[PDB]
Amino acid sequence: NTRVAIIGAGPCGLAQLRAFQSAAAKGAAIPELVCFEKQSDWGGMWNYTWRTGVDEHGEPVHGSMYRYLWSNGPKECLEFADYTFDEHFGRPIGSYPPREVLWDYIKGRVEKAGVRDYIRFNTAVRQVSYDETSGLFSVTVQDHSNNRVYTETFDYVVNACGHFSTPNTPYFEGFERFGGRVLHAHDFRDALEFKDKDILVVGSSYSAEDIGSQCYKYGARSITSCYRSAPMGYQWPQNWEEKPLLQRVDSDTAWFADGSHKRIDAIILCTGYQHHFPFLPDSLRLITENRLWPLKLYKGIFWEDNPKFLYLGMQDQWYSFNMFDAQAWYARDVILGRISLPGKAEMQAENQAWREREEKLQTAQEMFEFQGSYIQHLIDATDYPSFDIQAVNETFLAWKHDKYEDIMGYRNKCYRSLMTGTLATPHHTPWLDALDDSLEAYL
Template sequence: MVERIAIIGAGPSGMAQLRAFEAARESGAEIPEIVCFEKQADWGGQWNYSWRTGIDQHGEPVHSSMYRNLWSNGPKEALEFADYSFDQHFGKPISSYPPRAVLWDYIAGRVEASDVRRFVRFNTIVRWTQETADGFTVASENLADGETTTEHFDRIIVASGHFSFPNVPDFEGLENFTGEVMHAHDFRGAERLAGKRVLMIGASYSAEDIGMQAHKMGAELVTLSYRSHAMGFDWPAGVEELPLAVGFDGSTVTFRDGSVREVDAVVLCTGYLHKYPFLPDSLALSSPNNLYPDGLYKGTVWQGNPNLFYVGAQDQWFTFNMFDAQAWFVRDVILGRIALPDAEDRAADIRHWLAEYAALPDHDSEVVYQANYIRDLIERTDYPMFDLDEVVRIFQSWQHDKQVDIARYRDKTYPSVMTGTMAAVHHTPWLEEMDDSIERYLTPVGTASDSRDDAIDVGTRERGVSAAARVTRPTSRR
């Protein structure tokens, strides 16, 4: 009998898994029956922006943490698909740091071109999973009509991500704070912070980026509060770093070093939890956000039950192309192309990677570590190998650019590792660009808005067609 595979989530990780199976089918392989469960009305996961926060229209927790005016905070050349380039998608060079709508169009364009949408049940949430003697029983609910379905699957691939359940610590006196408090998960735009004194609690990418967005949109003062180590960038005037906030009294905040600030709004950039409410404890990954979660062989295969897989469960320097490497590896295990070692050997391999991870001295070595991990996966499959060392160099250059000028690093450009094409310089510096739309981004300033070559009709997205598909480009792919 044909195996049945459940993929939970149709964000970038789930989309990579769908594309991996479709690539095998296109090359003549027989693939399993696939059902992908996606609670949202469209795919894209975090990149599927919604104005909603808290609870969605179905009474479910809102999945996406995406905010309206996000731009990529890493060079697109470091996340490019090896089998679907930005050149292929857009038909022309674009800048190295696109806004969210452009990246969403790119990741969606690849899977739309390969017709894997037929595998996805949208508006459908997995409620519970139970191990059985011959696989798993999965109970799901169609959120549109409330119908519940229980069915059998031989294997499960968890691709739901781990940036949806916010970690929300408490601070003394915060319950009496007179301003606005939100977690980064519920942040949707920085315009509301114009003229305000804003406190960002956290010292990682969310705090850095939302803080700079607030500065860009006219916040009076942005204070970034760190627990262990300051980010240490050369912040522009109006942005500062202080040690951890330790107490609130009305609008007054006291910091660990004794500093005091008056604050109008607080954004908790305090990370996310690995949380899988659709899985029993025996199957649910429980891990801090790190580069190699314990319990996953090759970062994907659940040690306690090797018929359960995770894609995209680790912290990320690489993103889209790492999800691809994982998805191709998982696919080939399922198709029998890769034989798994026994439990003892898998455990030894996990210990090896964990020991290497524990010895890493700095961020540069973390990038190399993840590149080596991806290389290890790709060498076992037919996913196109790409110059991982060059991607590492791009990441290292990116970190240098941020140290030199945190407000303008997005104006830098890099060549594509896949095609060699040099990125275009965006027509407007990021700090001055207030229109994040795909239309403005892809239409050169000063040209007619209805240009057939460059204008993008985002409305085509609602008809299930990539907006960028209107641009003539090569159609060959793996």
């Protein structure tokens, strides 16, 4: 028969396994599936590790999540249409669960699907090549359980390796003279490390917002944030100041674009991440900034130069889990032969049409509605349940307004599931005081 390689057992890889299992449960013949995962367990970014830099086997540490991390959007926006919160938890819960609670939810679905046996854990993909004549990809991997490098062939490769793990780490004048810790958001683990310290966060997106907020919540003496161009602009607490871009640092002091200065103990670069695919030749290698519409990906998925090489989840994310499902189901239907792809020139013209719309977006609302409309297109093409994109959009709108209202209070609010209609119930403790991050303490 035919063979599919899946790189990664995070949400996207797991969605891809779930897609095939769902078809198989309803009598479809499916390919052989091999999912290569470098970590010891599934969950991707949702799997926490204390490790930083490089893991015990010498691979770059994948994990960017930190202690005390909670859902940064309404859980109702990322609900699986085919495995509801009601089915998983059997009661209502808060709209903004800690990492461990959503990890439990993600695992719950693939536990139920019985797909764990497709996965080869502790295995890092090292190289991918393609042979024109056989139409096969050769995938070379290192099995760290046995310290052995091996290669197998596959008809399709689905790259679900993520793009929020390889840091974008810009130098600033004087980092080599500064006496405090300099790290990337990717290396941030326990905010208690910065208790009673004066912290600088460099950046103006979610990592800056949230890492700064954890430092606040867990007793940092002061937060300073700085932006390259656009301030985050929220009303910050008393001990937080937002400044224009860092110019330089000396042994202990940071100097900003406006000529102001601050004594700081540590610098956290919240400067985003790179799409980094060291295991790909240029012929297969997506090169893009973090955005809603990278080019060369037909339906945001199929590599236009070789559409038997697929990318999942490589867009920037408003939607997340149910976008990955939408992608995984479309990918599956194409691999099964149910949906055929057009010719390259047509794929290129359509990708460019999406790009032109992408380039016009200005407002947050335009941006999540763009991605909503992309997902609507995918879900209409397959048997993934066509859920209510418009109502999810309205939830995202409400969340944005909650964050404006109170950047430290938005996680206390409650939203209705668009899959089941059940309202989320208030959490037992306000976010700011909910110091314990465990699944036990939350439930």
